[PDB]
Amino acid sequence: YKCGISKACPEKHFAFKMASGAANVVGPKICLEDNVLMSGVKNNVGRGINIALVNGKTGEVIDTKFFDMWGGDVAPFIEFLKTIQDGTVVLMATYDDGATKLTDEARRLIAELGSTSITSLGFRDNWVFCGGKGIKTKSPFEQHIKNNKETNKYEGWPEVVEMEGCIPQ
Amino acid sequence: YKCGISKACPEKHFAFKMASGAANVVGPKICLEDNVLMSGVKNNVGRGINIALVNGKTGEVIDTKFFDMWGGDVAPFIEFLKTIQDGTVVLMATYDDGATKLTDEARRLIAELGSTSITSLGFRDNWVFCGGKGIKTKSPFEQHIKNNKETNKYEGWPEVVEMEGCIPQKQ
């Protein structure tokens, strides 16, 4: 399968596989639609947050950048986050450390992209995230049982499908 | 617990419990915040897709409708889907059959609400879904491991965090 994933993605969906760095030795890896976007082999990764911007319609790479969140300036990273346009898939991966230079503004911008963990990201924590700006997210509340004569509880119809959960206010 | 759920819901969350119909005999059931929105007992369910519109801020019911996707017209259902306003929680449940009369336009509109299974919904399949329009949901693709010197795989740094999935294509 594309990117080396376990199951084939449904129609009109982009396959992805990503990993954070291993200490300060092995760089992170970002792969989308069987194309390696960022990696140590590609030599386009570095210490801090490694970001890949992808076109939400075609699946093609827009830009790949890395910002040193230990020994670098947060200002060009905040500027890069603000330039992100609507309909862009945002893939982020840490290498060594991606939290020391983070500000409230930087954490707020990443949280707006769909991140829950960025507000609690600390020194040397490993983190992988795939969000976006102006991208419709699929619901985690969905259950579907196919009409299959082989296994149908009522023969002509399948069994009742049940679901319970908590919808965020 | 609210709706008769197994575990209590956390703060700023609406509790829900829903079930599809049982063949062409027992109607579907939709419950939100211990209030029965749609059921056979309430007599507001029928063959096809049973939809309950809920205010995303208060948790109160806006409207409940059912559209016959076997012997009915798809046009009033498409019109109903287009009238859904921003900040509305959409709960959908099948009864008997909810796919025969579905068109590409009807499947696209439901997919826009956060549905993955609507594109492959076939004759007499049972389906339950809880999505919404104009509600900002946090990403399902996120993995995070804290740096803890006592449990760290590399002592100074934690283990590699890996992730894989499927991003929905826009348009």
Curated annotation (Swiss-Prot), chain B:
Domain GG-type lectin span(s) in chain numbering: 12-170
Induction summary: By TGF-beta in epithelial cells.
Protein name as it appears in the record: Protein FAM3C
Disulfide bridges in this chain: 3-31, 9-166
GO annotation terms (biological process): epidermal cell differentiation; ERK1 and ERK2 cascade; gene expression; inflammatory response; keratinocyte proliferation; neutrophil differentiation; phosphatidylinositol 3-kinase/protein kinase B signal transduction
GO CC, one annotated term: extracellular region
Range of the intact protein held here: 56 to 226 of 227
GO molecular function, one term: carbohydrate binding
Gene this chain is encoded by: Fam3c
Localization: Secreted; Cytoplasmic vesicle
Taxonomy, superkingdom: Eukaryota
Function in brief: May be involved in retinal laminar formation. Promotes epithelial to mesenchymal transition.
Recorded family membership: Belongs to the FAM3 family.
